[PDB]
């Protein structure tokens with residue numbers, strides 16, 4: 001059962017928790033509060049926590065920037081090895 | 097972190113696992129293999145395991161039959177107390 005799926009929690013709690021984490025890339029997927037039906041990827045990086053809105057196309061694939069995936073699961077794993085950001089190199093790693 | 101979110105697993109493994117469970121209502125949400133981008137709710141009931149396709153409307157709310165929710169989280173909790181089925185009375189309960 002995935003350890004990164006936190007269901008519907010408030011952005012700030014995600015921040016509060018993640019800020020407590022030790023490694024850059026620790027993340028969780030949460031269900032959006034501001035954007036009902038949208039997922040939000042939260043990841044730790046340095047002093048801050050960043051959030052990426054998970055997009056979904058007309059065919060329903062999800063993606064962050066351009067490469068499409070047919071599941072949060074896939075998208076998550078994929079970025080475990082391909083930066084989630086384009087400025088910095090941030091790789092997802094399971095929270096502790 | 098929710099114990100019912102299994103990410104993307106094959107329907108049959110869900111069946112295999114759930115069949116092993118002890119109580120009617122033990123369930124998990126899995127990402128659909130046949131319907132990419134769609135979630136599937138699997139629940140145990142008697143000898144069988146049932147699957148409900150999780151619908152999503154144009155506003156993006158999710159639902160199973162008619163009452164809409166803005167998150168799998170909510171939808172899941174709600175049915176912990178309101179049968180997921182209309183013939184039988186099946187309530188979600190966390191897997192073991």
Ligand SMILES: NC(=O)[C@H]1CCCC[C@H]1NC(=O)C1(NC(=O)[C@H](Cc2ccc(OP(=O)(O)O)cc2)NC(=O)OCc2cccc(N)c2)CCCCC1
Nearest residue numbers: 011032033034035039040050051052053054055063064065
């Ligand atoms: N997929 C992406 O997020 C890419 C591609 C599309 C747009 C933007 C890209 N993302 C980004 O540039 C970055 N993120 C963003 O632009 C994020 C994307 C996002 C938008 C809404 C969200 O709603 P929620 O918080 O209730 O769940 C969550 C995430 N935007 C963002 O944080 O805006 C500020 C913010 C502050 C307070 C409330 C909200 N909703 C949003 C990358 C990380 C640093 C900040 C910029």
Ligand SMILES: NC(=O)[C@H]1CCCC[C@H]1NC(=O)C1(NC(=O)[C@H](Cc2ccc(OP(=O)(O)O)cc2)NC(=O)OCc2cccc(N)c2)CCCCC1
Nearest residue numbers: 107128129130131135136146147148149150151159160161
């Ligand atoms: N939300 C629902 O599922 C309600 C409302 C809309 C349609 C049907 C309703 N569901 C149902 O009647 C019941 N379920 C159904 O009709 C389910 C709904 C569903 C459809 C596709 C799915 O794809 P996946 O397996 O790869 O994830 C998963 C679930 N249908 C179903 O099991 O069809 C048989 C089946 C067999 C083999 C492969 C597939 N995909 C489907 C309730 C439980 C007993 C069976 C009937």
